[PDB]
Structure formats: structure tokens, C-alpha cells
């Protein structure tokens, strides 16, 4: 019953009679399972902030590190995770990859209360939170199997889009629930509900430069989503950031949707190019907002500039993905025309190739959510400035926009 042996999505008759209904149902359970995995992935971006408030004495370098490490394991587990769905099947893997997330969620619910818990423990739990970051790879591969090649866009769009919204959901919930264990426990009932719901409701089917472009855009969304709260507390220790810090990732997520549509409207490489300009320009204006020696800083501006870095990292993600998508469509066109084949064959293989390549592009891309906050770690621990790290980002976004020129346009 759970196993499907005759799967013909490219066949309209099949889709009408049963495919659409089955694929639709798998999507609807896939989505909550994915956003939840994002919630768990970015935990410390609301937990490392509250660690001293409960009596833990850790360096800011030790609080940024815990916020950075999930993206190391996440990145390393994305390649394997993409091979898991063909091996174990969508339903078995969704249930497992969603279920095992209770381990790290419960653990740090305890460890945060016992004020004598070593740093070595918190390293492990954060690294186990990185497992949830790999779920994206498997979830996305799974969906690509359920949908025909020319429906695939929207469904993949819905899956990753609403999944990414998981960061923003946690940022909003973890403070509200804290009235600590609460931030890390309120998802155990939801993880379980949806491990069960997958198990009984889902089905088992029987260019390095583009890594750099995705790294610069998505790795930045996740990188900022991790370290922003922690940064807006060493720069403005007076303001309680966890009633604003969700709005960043939320706005960034919505910017993905716009990114792709805008990109096909006036050029994937153009919107990418113009966006890195806005990504360096906005990296610069953040110097003027800081509380520096003698000079009084401004929060409103600092916050609004980050709210513009989240927007610009969001657009860039949906802009680089349409770039990749378009590059692969062109390559598959040329090979098939040379083989003397079908426009249909080309369309299918362009979809296959963009999906097979994703488990590797999003692995390289996820390395950014380690660097950005570990940059704020090493900068604010060598000096007393975020400037040292923030200077490297500015240099990087320039290095990227020259690279988009050098190869495209």
C-alpha cells in the first residue's frame, strides 16, 4: 500500500487518474516536515542568545561557534541525504530524518537547565541540530520524483520556499514559548505528530562557480539568520532582540519567490549582478550604524540595514537558482539537438540535471552559515569589532560580482 510500483508522472492519463492526487498528498506532508527541520536547524540562533541569561559563562566566540556548527554537519550531510531517498524511499526517509530530530531537541532541553553542563556537550547538540539542515536535500529530491518535469518547478518552489520559512517560524516561537527548555521542547509534539503523519500518509517509490554564487546568496541568508540575534546583543545589549530577529529570515524567505520571477523577467545573470552590488553597498552602510569609540550607534538603522541584507540574500538565492536552472536547460538543449533528439527529452533532462546537482550545490552553499557567524566569532574575539569580519563580506560580494561579470552577461 505504501510502496508504489507503477509511477508514471510524465504520462498525463496516469497523472489525472492517480498521480496528481498521490503527489499532492506527499507534498502536503513533505512541507510541514521540512519547515520543522528548519526550525530545528537554526535553534541556537535563539538559544545561544539566552545561554548567559540562565547562568552559563561562555565567550561570545563560544556563543557564535554554537550558532555556526550546525551548518558544518548540515553541509556535510546534504550529499549523503540526497542518495537516501532512492535507497530507503521517500516515506521511510522522511519519517526517520524527521523522527531522529527529537534526540537533539530533548537533550538541550535538559542541558540548558543544568548550569554545570560542559561546552563539549553543547558542541555535540549543535552538531546534531545540523542533521536537520540536511533534510532539505532529501525532501527536495523526493519531491522531484513525484512531479513531472514541467510541474516540478512550482512543487519544488513550494517545498523549499515554505521549508525555508522554518527559520522565521522558530525565531518567532522560541521567545513566546520561553514563559530555557521551552525553546527546544515545543517542537517535540510537532516532530512526533509529523513523523507519524509521514509514516502513514506518504509513499515510497520503487559548474563550481554556481556553487560559489549559491554560497554567496543562500549561505548568507543562513549565515545572517544564525548570527544576527547574537550580534545585535553585543552591539546593543540593552535591546531584547528576539521580538524583532524573526522578521529578518521571514522577509528573506519571501524574497526567494520574487528573486526567480524577477530573474526570468529581466535576466538571471542581470538580477544576480545588480544584487551583489546591493549586497556590497549594504555591507558598507553597516559601519555607519555601529556604536564605535566615542560615537553613539543607532539600532533602527543597523536593524533596517540587516533587514535589507536579508532581502538581498533572499532575492539572490531565487536568482542564482534560476541562473543554474537556465544554464542546465541550455546545456541539455545543445546535447539533445546534437544527438538529434526531442525538445521533450531536453526539458526532462534539464529538470533531472538541476535536481541531481542540487544535493551538491546546496552542500557547498550551506558552508556559509558556518563562516558568517564564525567570522563574527573570530573578529569580535581578536578585536572588539564586527568590522573585521564585516570587511571580509564586503570584499567577498565584490569578488562575486566581478565573477558574475567574468563568466556571464
Amino acid at each position: 500500500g505504501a510502496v508504489i510500483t507503477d509511477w508514471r508522472p510524465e504520462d498525463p492519463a496516469f497523472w489525472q487518474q492517480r498521480g496528481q492526487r498521490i503527489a499532492s498528498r506527499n507534498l502536503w506532508i513533505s512541507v510541514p516536515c521540512l519547515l520543522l527541520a528548519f526550525c530545528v536547524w537554526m535553534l541556537f540562533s535563539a538559544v545561544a542568545v539566552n545561554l548567559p541569561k540562565v547562568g552559563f559563562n561562555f565567550t561570545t566566540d563560544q556563543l557564535f561557534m554554537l550558532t555556526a556548527l550546525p551548518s558544518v554537519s548540515g553541509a556535510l550531510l546534504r550529499v549523503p541525504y540526497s542518495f537516501m531517498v532512492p535507497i530507503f524511499g521517500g516515506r521511510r526517509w522522511t519519517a526517520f530524518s524527521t523522527g531522529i530530530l527529537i534526540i537533539p531537541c530533548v537533550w538541550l532541553g535538559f542541558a540548558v537547565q543544568d548550569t554545570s553542563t560542559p561546552y563539549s556537550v553543547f558542541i555535540i547538540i549543535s552538531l546534531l541540530c545540523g542533521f536537520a539542515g540536511a533534510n532539505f536535500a532529501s525532501s527536495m529530491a523526493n519531491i522531484s520524483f513525484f512531479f513531472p518535469k514541467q510541474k516540478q518547478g512550482g512543487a519544488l518552489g513550494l517545498n523549499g520556499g515554505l521549508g525555508n520559512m522554518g527559520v522565521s517560524v522558530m525565531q518567532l516561537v522560541a521567545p513566546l514559548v520561553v514563559s530555557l527548555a521551552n525553546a527546544s521542547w515545543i517542537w517535540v509534539p510537532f516532530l512526533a505528530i509529523f513523523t507519524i503523519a509521514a509514516w502513514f500518509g506518504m509513499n515510497d517509490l520503487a559548474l563550481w562557480i554556481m556553487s560559489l554564487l549559491y554560497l554567496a546568496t543562500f549561505g548568507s541568508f543562513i549565515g545572517f539568520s544564525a548570527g544576527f540575534a547574537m550580534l545585535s546583543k553585543t552591539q546593543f545589549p540593552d535591546v531584547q532582540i528576539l521580538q524583532y530577529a524573526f522578521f529578518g529570515p521571514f522577509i528573506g524567505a519571501l524574497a526567494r519567490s520574487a528573486g526567480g520571477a524577477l530573474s526570468d523577467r529581466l535576466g538571471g545573470t542581470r538580477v544576480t549582478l545588480v544584487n551583489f552590488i546591493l549586497m556590497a553597498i549594504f555591507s558598507g552602510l553597516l559601519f555607519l550604524t555601529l556604536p564605535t569609540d566615542g560615537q553613539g550607534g543607532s539600532f533602527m538603522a543597523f536593524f533596517a540595514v540587516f533587514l535589507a541584507l536579508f532581502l538581498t540574500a533572499g532575492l539572490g538565492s531565487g536568482s542564482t537558482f534560476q541562473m543554474i536552472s537556465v544554464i542546465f536547460r541550455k546545456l541539455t538543449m545543445d546535447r539533445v539537438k546534437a544527438e538529434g533528439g526531442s525538445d521533450e527529452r531536453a526539458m526532462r533532462e534539464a529538470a533531472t540535471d538541476t535536481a541531481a546537482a542540487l544535493g551538491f550545490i546546496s552542500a557547498i552553499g550551506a558552508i556559509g552559515g558556518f563562516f558568517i557567524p564564525k567570522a563574527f566569532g573570530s573578529s569580535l574575539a581578536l578585536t572588539g569589532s564586527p568590522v573585521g569580519a564585516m570587511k571580509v563580506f564586503l570584499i567577498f560580494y565584490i569578488a562575486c560580482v566581478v565573477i558574475t561579470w567574468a563568466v556571464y552577461g
Epitope: 510500483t5 496516469f14 489525472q16 487518474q17 492517480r18 520503487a206
Partner: antibody, heavy 118, light 107 residues
Framework: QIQLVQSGPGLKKPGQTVKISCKAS????????MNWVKQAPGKGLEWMGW????????TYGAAFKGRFSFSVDNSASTAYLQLSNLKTADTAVYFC???????????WGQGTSVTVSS | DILMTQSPSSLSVSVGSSVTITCQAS??????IVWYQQKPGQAPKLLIY???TLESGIPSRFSGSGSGRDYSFTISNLQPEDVATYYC????????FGGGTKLEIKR
């Protein structure tokens, strides 16, 4: 309690039309396709085609294009086979059967025997 | 159209004996094969789908295997109730029945 129950035996002269029905019950009718199978006396099962129960679209095997019609009444949750200009060779038992794709023909009707004779 | 040759067309086998029916497709049917049991005057009954997956309630004495163009079906501990005509069917491109195998039991 999944069941397909078909109408009863009919006798007809050559030149006439017959319409056999098949009531499905115990399952959501529009989720599964309906196949029709012919068995002439002392012959093997012969697949006639199916009808998509979302489309209402028919698909006919080569030998059954012309005088054959699959139709559908979704609200009655039943399927029909219409045979026009009956020939003697149409004498057979006719089965409806659920499913084109996963578990093909996993539930059968009891069959409906048609005799073409003067 | 994809053709299906079924062998044998009839056989007589002892109680507790093993039957083997083979089916050859005219081209690759990519594991989409089903097997039916047709006791006379009754409605056919699906035993196996997708080469080897037994329908629920169907006794373990039944089995199937194959790939590409070649498939077989087996009844191992033959009981008197197993008397019937058996059919393979291809449901790859359209559907095609095998010609049948009328199984007589011996006593």
C-alpha cells in the same frame, strides 16, 4: 466490502445494441480506472480497454475500435459498455475490472454473458 | 501491440507437486506483469502484481519472478482447490493477456 456487481445476461439479434453496467462499491470510484474484458466461449480473456474515471476518457485496444463505448456515471458510481451493431462474434462473457496502473484488475465483476443470435 | 506467449497451455500435475508457468513478452515490459486465477463460471482473481508481489490473502505457495521479457509463475504445494485457468498479463503499454494455462490436478 469492495465489490463490482454487473448487470445480468442478455440475448440479442445481430444488428442490435446492448449496454452492460457495472456498479462499484466500497471505494472511491473516481480514484481507479475501469477495465473491460471479453471472454468468448472456450477462449482466453481478451482486454478491450479502460476508461479513466477522472477524465471520463476512453482507451480501446486495437480490436475494439468502432462498435464499442465505455461510458461513466460518476454519481451512480457505475460504468457502462455499449455495443452497437452486434455480430455473432460478440457472444461472450464481459467483465469489468478495477485498476489500470498499480494492481491491475485487482477486483472483477461477476461477468455478464451476452448471446448474439436470431 | 505487446504480445504475450504463455507456456504451457495445459498440464496435469500431482497433489503436492510444483507447477511452473512461463510467459514471454514481445518486448520489455519492465516488471509490469500480473497473474490471474480463473476458476470456471467465477470471476477471475488477482494473485500477483508487479512480477512478484502477492495480493493480500493469497497463500504463500504462490510466487512469480522475471524481468525484461521473461516471467514465470509457480504454485509449489499443489492442492485440489488450485484447479483453474491461469493468466499472465502485461500492463506496461496498454494491456495484454497470455493465452492461459488450464491446470488439471491428478489423483
Amino acid at each position: 466490502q469492495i465489490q463490482l456487481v454487473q448487470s445480468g445476461p442478455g440475448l440479442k439479434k445481430p444488428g442490435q445494441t446492448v449496454k452492460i453496467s457495472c456498479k462499484a462499491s466500497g471505494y472511491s470510484f473516481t480514484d481507479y480506472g475501469m477495465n473491460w474484458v471479453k471472454q468468448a466461449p472456450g477462449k482466453g480473456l481478451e482486454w478491450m480497454g479502460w476508461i479513466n474515471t477522472s477524465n471520463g476518457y476512453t482507451t480501446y485496444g486495437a480490436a475494439f475500435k468502432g462498435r464499442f463505448s465505455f461510458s461513466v456515471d460518476n454519481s451512480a458510481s457505475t460504468a457502462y459498455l455499449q455495443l452497437s451493431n452486434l455480430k455473432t462474434a460478440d457472444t461472450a462473457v464481459y467483465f469489468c475490472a478495477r485498476s489500470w496502473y498499480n494492481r491491475a484488475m485487482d477486483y472483477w465483476g461477476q461477468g455478464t454473458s451476452v448471446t448474439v443470435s436470431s | 501491440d505487446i504480445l504475450m506467449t504463455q507456456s504451457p497451455s495445459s498440464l496435469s500435475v500431482s497433489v503436492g507437486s510444483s507447477v511452473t508457468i512461463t510467459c514471454q513478452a514481445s518486448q520489455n515490459i519492465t516488471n509490469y506483469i500480473v497473474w490471474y486465477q480463473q476458476k470456471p463460471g467465477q470471476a477471475p482473481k488477482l494473485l500477483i502484481y508487479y512480477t512478484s508481489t502477492l495480493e493480500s490473502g493469497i497463500p504463500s505457495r504462490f510466487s512469480g519472478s522475471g524481468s525484461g521479457r521473461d516471467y514465470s509463475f509457480t504454485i509449489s504445494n499443489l492442492q485440489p482447490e488450485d484447479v483453474a485457468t491461469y493468466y499472465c498479463l502485461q500492463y506496461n503499454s496498454l494491456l495484454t493477456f497470455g493465452g492461459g494455462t488450464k491446470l488439471e490436478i491428478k489423483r
